[PDB]
Symmetry: D2
């Protein structure tokens, strides 16, 4: 009797008021009997000329595409972003042009490590990907529910993902892998501390915040630029699940977040987020006491306050999930003029990985998929062909550039902003950037002892199943942040170890 | 110039009287400079943040799809099929519903053995596929320029195709392979004789006939059935290129068939074909002097004369060749009600092979591409998902059948025609059915002494390159068709063997 | 300190005393630093010439392949099959040739509806696939832990699967879908009663049986044929979990089946199964009160007793799960001489489905994958090419049959059995084919009073969520099996709809 | 009395010295009783699904084809070795150059450029000359051409140039407007177009042509010192070309002339060889070079940069299966062992991405598991896993994350990349107006005699004539800037054609 459990009945109401459609093959031929197969006699074998069977059976056999290598389990919704404040002094992006402008958006939430059948309510970072359909093209802000990440170099991302997933022989989640990587890489202390905090299991997707995480770049109409951070905080309030609640729910309803989001929109409780930016000038980036492009660190609110910008509103549920959610593609490199990448190593690597994996998971022409289409921008270029090529393939337009025959032209208004760099082209070590200073501020200044104990309990509940030498180096890293942090964990580890 | 050479100039005189479009990325983001790459300094290395380069380059790297395993080289056009005579007593198909009914058609000609770079004017059968967009879905008549073929059992087709293409080690056309298989399978004599006659290299595609080759089955409104052939003869006249003419044109213009057909439609010289059918009753099927479903045999006109039905007209050149011709897919299994298959073993195998290879060459959802979409029918079934799902995926419609929720329903007016078959289920040998009779009639009656000489010499020019024991068995088959036939070729071979 | 948790340390104890391997790219180039990405200066952007990063990131972007459309969540193991008795009177199959002959096997257990991330201890059928690498090629016996199935016609299979999986709009398991199809298809009664009994949730894969379910056909050396059923019963004893235990484990260890099997093998507690068959002669097939090819029916033991055959033993864990378990493919069409298919419409449908779905999920040459390779037979034929062709591609052997150059030859002894059938070619309706007779026997004779209580409880526990009109027609089906059956369920349903 | 290619099926059979035929099996190894007749219900009845033999063979026939190479689709392949003759360890520490007399297996694919899988070999086109070294430090792919230069000097123009070299997107026909509108708007193409439309446009097979790395590369020695090098391999068979008349004839008579020619030469023992040289430019001379030494449209003059010998390439083994060993072979310019790196050549930078990207598309994500692409002389050990058509053991139970405490593969600092300092703005620097004419004039006036200049002009005219007049005018102005005689001679011919 919930809106999700009645969707077939609601879809019906319209069909009772018509007749049914005629059942057809894929080629549109009417089917006379699709409940019984063609055989010679009632007890005879099946015949090849039963095309109706093979046509439907062969499409069933190809229903599955590869799930996302990460963030495989998720839920999608649609709505709009509305400007509420003028930040045209920082970014000339059309999406910020004037107060009151609405831009259609697509959103997909997710976990990270679990695959397409896992539970929603498990401890994991929560993906929060937003796709803005602007006139200067699509702007993908592929954020998640934390301002930081576990690593600061993108070449370590496949290893970290491997360590979070299944053992390659046993196919089991391996704590030895999980904490051997985290202990050997102490830059994860910051996001690990956030991961095992209360915010590690949000109460559905509507009660959590979202962050672009990376430092980005904004460019105004004068060609001047600043660096920035994208925040969108829930208007529904920060709400989490205790580990007792999510465990029950992980079995009771592994699709808790999907059901919650669909039911909420289906009854008009349209969720919303307030969209902010932090701004840091180039001079301020030269005097920041850390690397401003270090994904393990936040811009403190005192020195870089939140400037409000707008509002994210989700008011439409997907009609077909596979078409509109499973096949949606977010590319962090989808950035319209007035918004550019920073030299954040992690973001730099993301600029390659997403279109690369999307050409594998979906296909070379994945931007032709309806939800991925920049349907508010006029696409015209010199790319042609590819498997599953749709529309007119830009027809008979000349396919080489430059040309003398009227094909599209570049326009200097969309050219990037120039930055001077100097240095050797090599691999600079960032393993020993500051790993504990901002974490100590998190352990002492952000949490109460009620949250400190739950956090130390949350880590010890899972680290206990790793090897003792791993716990040694793990605790060693927590004591460098706070001796309270380590010894608190160490006592609880002494408990499970007996 | 000819309308083919001027196609870029004409596009300029239709579009380029306005401003030029905006050159964008795949995601629609405008591009300021698509002529120079992003580097650090004028002589510095390339940067990953030049995603404009990666967007265009990665799509270029993915343009190519597998060519057709056969008939890789061809040309496409579009037009209509119009009804001129009433054959509704034979077939209830909506395509012949009333005289004057027009149906949009898609057509693609082709050679057979050559790949995408081969020449048009070479000795080879000529594919002639026609796609009818009917209200009952698409009907694909995937014919060629001969009423017969080389074999009568589909299990030998992959080897015959292998024998006609490149040697697996040298990648060269091997005459040993061609005539070893042909001498070992004398059922090929009928189509080998047609291949080496003047028709083997028709003057383009407008000057050849088209045939469904196979015996088909027609069903009227009262359930009664008849067996039929599909003929469509050229209205522009039969015309053939000579050996020196085609050899020269293979050098001067490999794409002769493309250019000729394109320019004809472009100068309003629309080619056309007169549609016919032969009808054979089920009682006549039992009295037929051969297997009536034997693809190596014709139905003689004296005993089974042609019957007018309609006309085929091609009057629209493709706008983008890749999207409309290279991506087009014809399935002989695509038959609307009133048109069914016969027990032709060859056709029986083709029922599986085409939708099977199309899921590979194009993809599981290849019917979603525009030219293969049945855009005059209403596709409604319980198939969902698949790679590159292009439509709404039928929304939130119930995906299972039967169901109590108004989803599509089978209609019993589309049921197939039921007939009894007699015998054990078993591999029946057709290798030594009649191989020579209808070939002797082709040699003595269909040709004159001018055409026999030119045909015998055409065979000798290719058979001479195989080994002697291959020439021997080949002559043994030709001598078995007619003594003058075999001795004629043996005379030429002796000359070449010197 | 179970062997699963200590897999990495055990692997390192085999290192120990070996210097670790040099870390390379895909092309074998040694890597200097795989922990830091190339940039222009310590805080400059990323460079395309960091091929090491791209080489690794691009492969991580492609790790995932489509999961199985059904039976996605599974566990694999290896061992052997040993012949214990003499059934050469029935089957000339070399896999049964002598008592004591050992044939290697590979096995995969699985759930059905859950996808890759789902839990093991849920109510579902349990796939039990066995691949026999025989000297006559591979024999795939793709069974599950029940001798019957929900349907008896393969064209209903996509819809049954669709109704068991997620709603197309909400992406949630939909009880209306599950029971609308089940209520409208009473042929599901027999397997539904099994599914919701105690046997619906086995305590791991070692404590369940396996059945081929379908009728098969055995042929001996003298051409005599008989029909057959396959049975292999667990020597570890049938053991099932309560829904309370199963629901609890689905939160603790969703991989309960994988862990129990991996650790049982690794501690030498090899599970085993006793392989049986039931034999029905063709004369008994026509006298049989039921249709001996209806997948919803069993063969009663009193009239067709279990004939012992051999032993299945699993004594080796997989080394790489993805390479050995995820990529393994079973085709019921893989059958050596002495083992044939029956006119069982369901099996007839499966003959096409598995190779079809493996060419998509895995690739056209998925038989080249080692676990799918028939490494005890010599593959030699005229198939060539295909994407990712890995072996010698059969070198430079003549690729056409027949030929005169000593290529592989057919041998007539491997010919199939020839039956004569009778009747039209048409779709015969099998919806009302005795849907209750063997179900009432299951309720009355097989079960005690407790089992009936749990059965009706497990039924009403899930049917409670279907619409009232869906419950009525469902209770109608159960009451047709037995008035006590459907009234006990109805008595429970009213306590749920209150 | 027939070339070895013709007799290959006969030679295959007689290799079976009275062996007895292999048993015909399905894909899964099941013996086939009758692969000549399909299963029917009666002699005149319809086909049955339980004929698994027919479907198994047919469905694999339906999937034989893979996408062709987006460029260089038409070509031939051969295998052999590279032998070191001189000591260049002063310049590079590559194991393939380790000591004099050291041999390394090589695989080579020759190719044309524009035509697809069915085109003719003896047509005017650049010739691909890719060489794969299976060294103990992994594979070294040297993906070269038969010319030391190219048409453009920025990788972003390569798709547009290739498009303008292939078929018109509506008519599927070759288009002179497309071809000569791009070249005339991009006058950096002058240098390589002149080489194209000279006598070296249609070589007489693959054995009678040179090979070059074209790009400037970098060589690093054992001390960490680097230079800028050019790779050269010269035919030991002599420069030999086909006339326009004979090339036209052979394109019809024998479309696969080069494939056949190379195969018979190896099969009769006439193994072709190429002497491997290197040009060497220090970093000081790099700052003094009158052009951009990383400009792919320019060569280092031999008088100023002489050839230093290294060894010879030798092709002595034909492929056994063309599809598996030639059609499926994959060369990646980014396959470079230590002691060999890339220069900031913008064209080389784009190719670092394109080939492994296009190879994951054409062949599949795990294309390095294909044998002819396998670096079978080095032990692959990394933290990559799974993927479509995972072939070997997938590295077993080895830990799949780095760093790790369980003895999995480790980086070694001896393979670390050479470091160069760069300075400037990060932006798009224009190189369209670099020197486009200086070396083009040297080739027109000195490398060619009067007889070759006429054939050169007649080849440009015989093709450019089919373009529109306004394209001919801007094209001649480009040739005029090379030399007035150059532009005037072409204009003299074009006026004859256009009448
Ligand atoms: C018309 C009926 C059926 C059809 C069309 C069908 C189809 C399929 C398909 C497409 C797969 C995926 C295979 C893969 O991707 O690896 C599969 C898996 C499987 N099926 Fe069915 N199925 C049917 C009924 C059955 C029956 C009757 C049984 C057993 C008696 C069964 C047992 C299994 C098992 C065990 C697997 C998993 C194989 C593995 O572990 O890799 N199925 N089926």
């Amino acid at each position: 009797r919930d809106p999700a459990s009645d969707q077939m009945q609601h879809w019906k109401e319209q069909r009772a008021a018509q007749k049914a459609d005629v059942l057809t093959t894929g080629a549109g031929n009417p089917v006379g009997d699709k409940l019984n197969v063609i055989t010679v006699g009632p007890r005879g074998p099946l015949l090849v000329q039963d095309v109706v069977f093979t046509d439907e059976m062969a499409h069933f056999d190809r229903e599955r595409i590869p799930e996302r290598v990460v963030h495989a389990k998720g839920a999608g919704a649609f709505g709009y972003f509305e400007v509420t404040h003028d930040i045209t002094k920082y970014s000339k992006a059309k999406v910020f042009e004037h107060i009151g402008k609405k831009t259609p958006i697509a959103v997909r939430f997710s976990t990270v490590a679990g695959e397409s059948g896992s539970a929603d309510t498990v401890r994991d970072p929560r993906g929060f990907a937003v796709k803005f359909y602007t006139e200067d093209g699509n702007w993908d802000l592929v954020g998640n529910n934390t301002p930081i990440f576990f690593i600061r170099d993108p070449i370590l991302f496949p290893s970290f993902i491997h360590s979070q997933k299944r053992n390659p022989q046993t196919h089991l989640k391996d704590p030895d892998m999980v904490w051997d990587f985290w202990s050997l890489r102490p830059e994860s202390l910051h996001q690990v501390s956030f991961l095992f905090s209360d915010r590690g299991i949000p109460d559905g997707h509507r009660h959590m915040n979202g962050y672009g995480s990376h430092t980005f770049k904004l460019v105004n109409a004068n060609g001047e630029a600043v660096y920035c951070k994208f925040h969108y905080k829930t208007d529904q309030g920060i709400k989490n699940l205790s580990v007792e609640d999510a465990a029950r729910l992980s079995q009771e309803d592994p699709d808790y977040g999907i059901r919650d989001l669909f039911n909420a929109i289906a009854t008009g409780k349209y969720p919303s987020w307030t969209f902010y930016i932090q701004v840091m000038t180039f001079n301020q980036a030269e005097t920041f006491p850390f690397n401003p492009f270090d994904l393990t660190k936040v811009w403190p609110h005192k020195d870089y306050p939140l400037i409000p910008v707008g509002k994210l509103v989700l008011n439409r549920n997907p009609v077909n999930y596979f078409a509109e959610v499973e096949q949606i593609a977010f590319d962090p490199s989808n950035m319209p003029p007035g918004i550019e990448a920073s030299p954040d190593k992690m973001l730099q690597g993301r600029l390659f990985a997403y279109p690369d994996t999307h050409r594998h998971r979906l296909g070379p022409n994945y931007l032709h998929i309806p939800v991925n289409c920049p349907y508010r921008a006029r696409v015209a270029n010199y790319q042609r062909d590819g498997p599953m090529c749709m529309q007119d393939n830009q027809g008979g337009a000349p396919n080489y550039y430059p040309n003398s025959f009227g094909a599209p032209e570049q326009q200097p208004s969309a050219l990037e902003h120039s930055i001077q760099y100097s240095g050797e082209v090599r691999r600079f070590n960032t393993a020993n950037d500051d790993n504990v200073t901002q974490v100590r501020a998190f352990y002492v200044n952000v949490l109460n002892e009620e949250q400190r104990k739950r956090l130390c309990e949350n880590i010890a509940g899972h680290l206990k199943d790793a090897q003792i030498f791993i716990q040694k180096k793990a605790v060693k890293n927590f004591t460098e942040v706070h001796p309270d942090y380590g010894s608190h964990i160490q006592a609880l580890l002494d408990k499970y170890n007996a």
